[PDB]
Each structure stands twice: as structure tokens, then as C-alpha cells.
Amino acid sequence: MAVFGEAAPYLRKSEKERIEAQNKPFDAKSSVFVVDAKESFVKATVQSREGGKVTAKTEGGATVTVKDDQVFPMNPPKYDKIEDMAMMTHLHEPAVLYNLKERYAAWMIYTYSGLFCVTVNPYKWLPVYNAEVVAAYRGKKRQEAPPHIFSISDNAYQFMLTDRENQSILITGESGAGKTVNTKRVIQYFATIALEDQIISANPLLEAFGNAKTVRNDNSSRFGKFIRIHFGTTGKLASADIETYLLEKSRVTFQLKAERSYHIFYQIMSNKKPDLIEMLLITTNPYDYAFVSQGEITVPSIDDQEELMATDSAIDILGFTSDERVSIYKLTGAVMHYGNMKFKQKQREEQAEPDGTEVADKAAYLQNLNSADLLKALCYPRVKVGNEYVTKGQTVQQVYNAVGALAKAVYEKMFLWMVTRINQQLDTKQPRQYFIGVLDIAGFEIFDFNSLEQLCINFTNEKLQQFFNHHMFVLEQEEYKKEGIEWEFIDFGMDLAACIELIEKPMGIFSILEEECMFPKATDTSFKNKLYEQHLGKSNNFQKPKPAKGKVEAHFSLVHYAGTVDYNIAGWLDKNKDPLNETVVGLYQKSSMKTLAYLFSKGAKKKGSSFQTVSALFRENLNKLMTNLRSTHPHFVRCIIPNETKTPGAMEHELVLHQLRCNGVLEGIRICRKGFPSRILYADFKQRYKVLNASKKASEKLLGSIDIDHTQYKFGHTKVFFKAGLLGLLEEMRDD
């Protein structure tokens, strides 16, 4: 029992509760669940099986008739509070729902789910991470001590110590959901078991540059985050590294009405220091600058003034000179200025031309290069043809797309290089080796009105889901080679492939979108018709939107591992085209500041400066991830938010139901539940099955005598393998 220390009661209960819950009367004729009007699933109490009719009593005593397919048999109390739910004789939505609801009630936060380390959050100081569980969880294997994040961290540590292999921790928590704390927890755990201060110190400037509020939350971290903590050849902290991945681009010049651009803009708009406001030549009203003024400017949660000097100090403590910081500020100001550059068609042509060089002068001075030259090289580029140059023509719309891509590219380059500098200041020069992977990412965030970025995020999560699906497949399945029997002989990732191919293959959604962003006179309606005629009916994941619910418009319905979702197509075309000019990039290369430090200066498979598109860069760096990550052993953590407010213990279903799909842990449990989830020894088997027929041959006797078929199970040579829904049949009969 108390084999580790004192943290047990809020971590795990002792025997007395285990046995007081084990031996409890569990009927299987009224223990069924129910679908709810207010919630999803509560524990119901029916009279009997009246066909598709019941009087299902809730805790408030409900009576309504409910069909069979949504009243669910409850897991027994002998299976109550089990850590690894992948063995329960009932594997469904309510199974896991209450298997963690009652555990959060009993405060057993840290649970297991196959490979998933499901971890709820508290709202009160619980001493589960104290200086004794660090040694209690030290040296352990996975499944003997009670679950915890320290368990999996030490697991990955000893794993890399076994075969010099890189490992990775895949965490998924909402903005400000507590994962921002669990990351520092695991990194300091590793720092002891081998720094976190530098990590948290560099942290806020990141969210300054690349975070914003959305229609859902307030400090959404749009980019991806990945931390490489390398060790010596024996295990010794010899690195502190950081990776930014799939940083969103289109924010810098476009955002829907219910959100805004990144923080830094409005931060400078906040006038805690008019030194910048004068120096960056900007005014204070953000509605004066179109790139940032298409949504909600002021947020009623935090002001941006204090954040100015907060992130300023964040810069200062890191390896940044002062000129470096004035350069960052000037570049952000020029990004803001580009929006107001105006162009007008010439009267005798479609060639664009400038009207007022004022904002042109401002932006050009802000980079120390001529203004007339800048606007010329925007509205009169020239491309290298053969062994000379010709000056292409430009229409107004083309010039607007060009300057948009310009601002986007310079901003993302600023981001990537400041990250470079950060990871440049934080390294320790010890010769290092195989690292660990700490990676957060935006979850499967589906909304009431989807768009491009939502689809890209959902696609990233599709790739991740298939990744870990296949990993769990190989591990779990190919374990049982030694178990004298195999089952579910197909790969497990090969069912997300149907939804992936619909997005990434030739003639896929992304390919078609590229086609239309390249076609001469494409329009939104042509895009829709092309999508339909290429996919509708000729696939299954793709299907028609359903008009209802008074929502504005959906245009095509995709199905994922996290359920179906239908997207809105308006604006996808002009949001995706970003023709990067070249003469102006030369201008940048020949500037006088470290703006050119970004833009420092085969032909096959590389598109041209007029075929560039956002989705392509996505699909490129996404595969960069999904290969270097594939070169590293994974582990998974899930910071849930069980309640709207901070009332601990309580947990409403509908909200945790959503996180159950965003992380898609039910997908793992369902791919592991369509076979033999129950692998068990003789320990409980003989003692609870000898009651009907009062080792191996003894198992054969104690199984054949209790009226079970030899189809839905197999005891290979060591453990018996069982479906979930069969032990319940035994549960009530193995007790008599």
C-alpha cells in the first residue's frame, strides 16, 4: 500500500475502497445509461427491456421512452476506477465518461488510456508532484505504479537510456488550460533526474509575436511548438532548444470579424510608450490601418500596455542588442504601414500605378531604401528570362496580392529568426545526443463557421491521429506475435487514410484550390462546382452540407476521426494566393539593417514567384514535421478542462465530451475495442470462474463449463483475450 510515501489518498485509494467498490450488487437489466436532453449521458435506471421502450430513471427519476441504441450498459463496480480503461467489459462514450468523472470526483487525476495519459486538471493545490514521487516514479516501468505524468516522463527517459533513441511527448491543452504548467513540470522533472527558468523567460515574447484572440478564446497560440532537450551519451542535460512549426501566415493581413491580428500590433497601438508611436510613425487608432482593423481591436480581458514592457524585458534578458529591438519595431511598423499603400489603374491600360507616395515614403524610410524605387519595383517587376530580363506587367489586384505576400513573408521571417536567436542564447555547449520531444499544437478546433485555417488545423490533427494510430497499431498488435494468436490483422492508420487522401492527393481539395488560385478567371462559384464535380458522389468522406440551424452557409461536408464538419468556401481563393515579388526582395537584400538578415539572398519541383501558395508551404513543412517526428518515439498527454468554471471535482459531460473528440482518445479506445480489449491472467479468472464448475487445462475447464463460445476470444498461451461486452455476461453469472 504505502510503498512510496504519503501522496496516496488524493492520488489513489487504498484497499478498503477498492474492495468496498468491488463487491457491490451490479444488475445488468437496469444498469443501462441513457441519452440526455440537458447532458449527453447520465446513469439511468430502467424498468426492463420493453423493446425500444423503457422508463429510464435518472437521479432525478426520469421516465421517458428511449430506444436501445443510446441507453448504455454501465461498467461494473469491480471495474470501477480502473486506470487503463482499455480492459473494461464496456467500452463506449459513457464508459470512459464516467470512468473519469468518478475518478475526478475521487480526485484520481492521473489515469491511463492504452498509450494515452489522460490527465484532468485540478483547481486547488494537490501535492501529487512532490519530491518523493520523483523517486517513487523513478526507475519504474509503465504499468505497476499508479499513473502520472512523471511516470511517462521517466518511461521516456529510461527508454532513451535503453537504445539511445529519441522520444517525444505529445501534449494537447487549450490556451491557458494548465498544459503551460505541465510542460515546465516535466522539464524540471528531467532537470532533476538528469533550464526551465530560461524556457519560461523566453516564453511570453513568443505569444506576443504569434498569438491572438479568436471567436472561441483569447490567447490562442496559432503557431506550433516543439522543444528539444538533448542529453549526453549517458543521459545528461546538454541542450535547451525550441522549434516553431506551421506558424499561421494570413493573420497578418486578414482576420474574421470575431477576432484580430497578432498581439504586437495592438500592443504598440496601446500607448504605454509613445516613443514607438512617434518613432514608427504610426497613429494610435488601429482603425487607421486596414491590415489589423477588420475585427475586434480592444479585448475586454487584458490591456496591451503592460505587455509592451513585459515582452521588452523578455527580449532584454535574451541575446538581443538594442538596435536589434529597434529593427524589430521598425519592421512591425512597416508591416502595419503596407496596408495603406494605394494603387490606381492607368486610364489607357490595366497596368497598376501609385497615387500617393506618402505611406510609400513612410514604409520605405522605415527600411532605409528609396520609396520611388520601391513602388516602381512593385508595379514594374522583372523576371530573368533566358540570359536577360523582361519587365512583366501588373494589374492592381496583382500588386495588392504582392504587397500582402511581402508583409506576410517579412513577418514570418522575423518570427523564425527571433526564434533562431532565442535558441542561440539558450544552448549549453556540452556534446549532446538523443533528445526528448515536448510538442504542443492547436487541437481539433471545430467551430460554427469554419474556414481555411480551420481546415488546415484539422488536417494537421488528421496526420497526427493517423501517426499515433499506426504507432499504437504496431506496438499493441505486433506484441501478440509471442501470444500464440493474432487478431485485427489490418493496419490501424489505414482508416484515416480515406480522409487524408481526400485533402492531399492529386485532385484533392488542396490541389483543386491551387488550380483555382492559378486559373485565369477563377471565382468562388467555379471553385465550388469544380469541387463538387470532382468529388461529390465519387467518394464517401466528402458529402453535401445540410442547411439548417439558421447558420449562414456551409459548402461541403468532410468527415474526420473527430466527427463530421462542413466548411465555408467564400474567400479561400484570394486568401491563398501570395505571389512573392523578387525585385523587392532584392531591395531587401541590399538594405542597411538586419531586415536582410532574413532575406539573405534545383529548379525541379520548385514553383515560381507567381505560383506560390500558402497551402503548398503548409503541406511542405507539415511533412517535414511528420517525418522528423516519425523519427522519434511518441508519448501522449491530454490536459482536459472538465468544467466551465474552476469548481474542482464536478465535471459536465458535453464540454469534456468535446475534448474527448478534439484529442480523439475515444478513437484510440474504439480501434482498441473492436477486438480483445481484455487481456487477463488466471489470478482473478480461476478464483471468479471456479464458482460455476466447482493452469492451461484448468483454464480450458473453467471456460468451457460456463457456457461461452470459442469464437469471440482466445487464450493464446499466457493470457486470455476477451472482447469487452462478454465479461458483463459473465459478471452477473460468475457471481452465482
Buried b vs exposed e over 616-643: b needs ≥16 C-beta within 10 Å?
A: bebbeebeebeeebeebbbbbbbbbbbb
What the block records as the C-alpha cell of 83 is 486506470
Task: Please state, in angstroms and rounded to a whole number, the distance separating the CA atoms of residues 284 and 274.
Answer: 9
DSSP state of 629: T
Name the residue among 138, 475, 182 with its Cα closest to residue 169: 182
**What residues contact residue 662 under an 8 Å CB cut-off, 6+ apart?**
172, 443, 444, 445, 461, 562
At 720 the three-state DSSP class reads strand
Residue 239, annotated as binding a ligand? no
Paired residues of 344 in beta bridges: 353
Task: Please state, in angstroms and rounded to a whole number, the distance separating the CA atoms of residues 736 and 5.
Answer: 39
**DSSP characters over 135-161:** HHSTT--TTSSPP-HHHHHHHHHHHHH
What the block records as the C-alpha cell of 732 is 452477473
- The vertex-595 CA angle with 593 and 597, nearest 5°, equals 95
Task: Please state, in angstroms and rounded to a whole number, the distance separating the CA atoms of residues 368 and 83.
Answer: 63
Name the residue among 554, 553, 550 with its Cα closest to residue 542: 554
Task: Please state, in angstroms and rounded to a whole number, the distance separating the CA atoms of residues 704 and 683.
Answer: 18
Backbone angles phi, psi at 715, to 5 degrees: -95, 105
Beta strands in 160-315 (DSSP E): 167-172, 211-212, 220-221, 224-231, 241-245
Helices (H) and strands (E) counted in the chain, each on its own, are: 28, 19
What the block records as the C-alpha cell of 588 is 531587401
**DSSP characters over 452-472:** HHHHHHHHHHHHHHHHHHHHH
Which residue intervals of 293-367 are DSSP H helices?
A: 305-316, 322-338, 357-365
Residue 179, annotated as binding a ligand? yes
Residue 325 C-beta-side C-alpha neighbours within 13 Å: 16
**What residues contact residue 713 under an 8 Å CB cut-off, 6+ apart?**
676, 720, 721, 722, 723, 726
349 is catalytic: no
| Angle of the 179-193 helix axis to the 196-210 helix axis, nearest 10 | 150
Rounded to the nearest 5 percent, the helix, strand and coil shares of the chain are 45, 10, 45
Paired residues of 634 in beta bridges: 168
Task: Please state, in angstroms and rounded to a whole number, the distance separating the CA atoms of residues 61 and 192.
Answer: 53
**DSSP characters over 398-432:** HHHHHHHHHHHHHHHHHHHHHHHHHHHHS---S--
Which member of 113, 220, 332, 401 is catalytic? 220
Task: Please state, in angstroms and rounded to a whole number, the distance separating the CA atoms of residues 626 and 468.
Answer: 11
Instruction: Tell me how crowded residue 538 is: count the other CB atoms within 10 A of its CB.
Output: 9
Which burial class, exposed, middle or buried, applies to 690 when counting CB atoms under 10 A from its CB (0-12, 13-18, 19+)? middle
DSSP state of 434: E
Backbone angles phi, psi at 473, to 5 degrees: -55, -60
Which amino acid is it at 512? I
CA-CA distances (angstroms) from residue 467 to 172, 246, 479, 633? 15, 17, 18, 11
Instruction: Tell me how crowded residue 219 is: count the other CB atoms within 10 A of its CB.
Output: 16
Are β-strands 224-231 and 241-245 bridged in parallel, bridged antiparallel, or unpaired? antiparallel
Which amino acid is it at 550? G
What the block records as the C-alpha cell of 146 is 499508479
Residue 437 C-beta-side C-alpha neighbours within 13 Å: 23
| Angle of the 614-628 helix axis to the 452-472 helix axis, nearest 10 | 20
Contact (CB, 8 A) for 311 and 204: yes
Task: Please state, in angstroms and rounded to a whole number, the distance separating the CA atoms of residues 269 and 281.
Answer: 11
Task: Please state, in angstroms and rounded to a whole number, the distance separating the CA atoms of residues 98 and 257.
Answer: 38
- The vertex-78 CA angle with 75 and 83, nearest 5°, equals 75
Contact (CB, 8 A) for 272 and 305: yes
568 is catalytic: no
Residue 162 C-beta-side C-alpha neighbours within 13 Å: 10
445 is catalytic: yes
Place of cell 504542443: 440
Beta strands in 232-273 (DSSP E): 241-245
Task: Please state, in angstroms and rounded to a whole number, the distance separating the CA atoms of residues 160 and 574.
Answer: 47
Residue 675, annotated as binding a ligand? no
Instruction: Tell me how crowded residue 490 is: count the other CB atoms within 10 A of its CB.
Output: 9
Which residue intervals of 473-539 are DSSP H helices?
A: 478-479, 497-504, 509-518, 524-535
Structure-determination approach: cryo-EM
Buried b vs exposed e over 418-427: b needs ≥16 C-beta within 10 Å?
A: bbebbbeebe
Task: Please state, in angstroms and rounded to a whole number, the distance separating the CA atoms of residues 645 and 37.
Answer: 21
CA-CA distances (angstroms) from residue 442 to 456, 472, 582, 663, 685? 11, 22, 33, 10, 44
Contact (CB, 8 A) for 662 and 562: yes
Task: Please state, in angstroms and rounded to a whole number, the distance separating the CA atoms of residues 367 and 496.
Answer: 48
Name the residue among 562, 569, 542, 564 with its Cα closest to residue 461: 562
Paired residues of 242 in beta bridges: 227
Task: Please state, in angstroms and rounded to a whole number, the distance separating the CA atoms of residues 735 and 595.
Answer: 76
What the block records as the C-alpha cell of 372 is 520611388
180 is catalytic: yes
What the block records as the C-alpha cell of 229 is 532537450
DSSP state of 388: E
Which member of 217, 357, 609, 628 is catalytic? 217
Are β-strands 713-715 and 720-722 bridged in parallel, bridged antiparallel, or unpaired? antiparallel
Q: How far is CA 644 from the centre of its chain?
A: 20
Residue 674, annotated as binding a ligand? no
Name the residue among 366, 370, 406, 404 with its Cα closest to residue 280: 366
What the block records as the C-alpha cell of 102 is 468518478
Contact (CB, 8 A) for 112 and 147: yes
**What residues contact residue 134 under an 8 Å CB cut-off, 6+ apart?**
150, 189, 192, 193
What the block records as the C-alpha cell of 484 is 500464440
Task: Please state, in angstroms and rounded to a whole number, the distance separating the CA atoms of residues 109 and 101.
Answer: 10
Contact (CB, 8 A) for 378 and 584: yes
Name the residue among 80, 86, 128 with its Cα closest to residue 100: 80
Task: Please state, in angstroms and rounded to a whole number, the distance separating the CA atoms of residues 328 and 615.
Answer: 27
What the block records as the C-alpha cell of 327 is 529593427
296 is catalytic: no
Which amino acid is it at 445? E
Which member of 30, 176, 324, 515 is catalytic? 176
CA-derived radius of gyration, the chain? 29
Paired residues of 690 in beta bridges: none
Task: Please state, in angstroms and rounded to a whole number, the distance separating the CA atoms of residues 584 and 375.
Answer: 9
Which member of 175, 293, 628, 632 is catalytic? 175
Buried b vs exposed e over 314-341: b needs ≥16 C-beta within 10 Å?
A: bbeebebeeebeebbbbbbbbbbbbbbb
Contact (CB, 8 A) for 7 and 132: yes
**DSSP characters over 647-714:** -SS---HHHHHHHHHHTTHHHHHHHTTSS--EEE-HHHHHHHHTTT---HHHHHHHHHTT---SSSEE
Residue 173, annotated as binding a ligand? yes
Backbone angles phi, psi at 334, to 5 degrees: -70, -40
At 62 the three-state DSSP class reads coil
443 is catalytic: yes
- The vertex-667 CA angle with 663 and 672, nearest 5°, equals 130
Task: Please state, in angstroms and rounded to a whole number, the distance separating the CA atoms of residues 483 and 503.
Answer: 39
What the block records as the C-alpha cell of 578 is 501570395
- The vertex-135 CA angle with 131 and 136, nearest 5°, equals 105
221 is catalytic: yes
Which amino acid is it at 180? T
Residue 237 C-beta-side C-alpha neighbours within 13 Å: 14
**What residues contact residue 710 under an 8 Å CB cut-off, 6+ apart?**
none
Name the residue among 103, 102, 137, 104 with its Cα closest to residue 121: 104
CA-CA distances (angstroms) from residue 80 to 19, 420, 625? 11, 49, 39
What the block records as the C-alpha cell of 16 is 478498503
- The vertex-598 CA angle with 593 and 604, nearest 5°, equals 140
At 728 the three-state DSSP class reads helix
**DSSP characters over 353-381:** EES-HHHHHHHHHTTTS-HHHHHHHHHS-
Contact (CB, 8 A) for 121 and 174: no
At 632 the three-state DSSP class reads coil
Task: Please state, in angstroms and rounded to a whole number, the distance separating the CA atoms of residues 106 and 85.
Answer: 16
Q: How far is CA 688 from the centre of its chain?
A: 43
Are β-strands 116-119 and 633-639 bridged in parallel, bridged antiparallel, or unpaired? parallel
Instruction: Tell me how crowded residue 555 is: count the other CB atoms within 10 A of its CB.
Output: 18
Residue 596 C-beta-side C-alpha neighbours within 13 Å: 15
Between the CA atoms of 388, 391, 392 and 394, what dihedral angle is there, to the nearest 10 degrees?
A: 160
After which residues does the chain show a gap where C to N exceeds 2.5 Å? Answer: 194, 601, 694
711 is catalytic: no
Residue 627, annotated as binding a ligand? no
Resolution in A: 3.3
CA-CA distances (angstroms) from residue 368 to 282, 360, 374, 576, 707? 17, 12, 11, 30, 87
Contact (CB, 8 A) for 613 and 410: no
Instruction: Tell me how crowded residue 553 is: count the other CB atoms within 10 A of its CB.
Output: 12
Task: Please state, in angstroms and rounded to a whole number, the distance separating the CA atoms of residues 18 and 108.
Answer: 13
Which member of 93, 207, 248, 445 is catalytic? 445
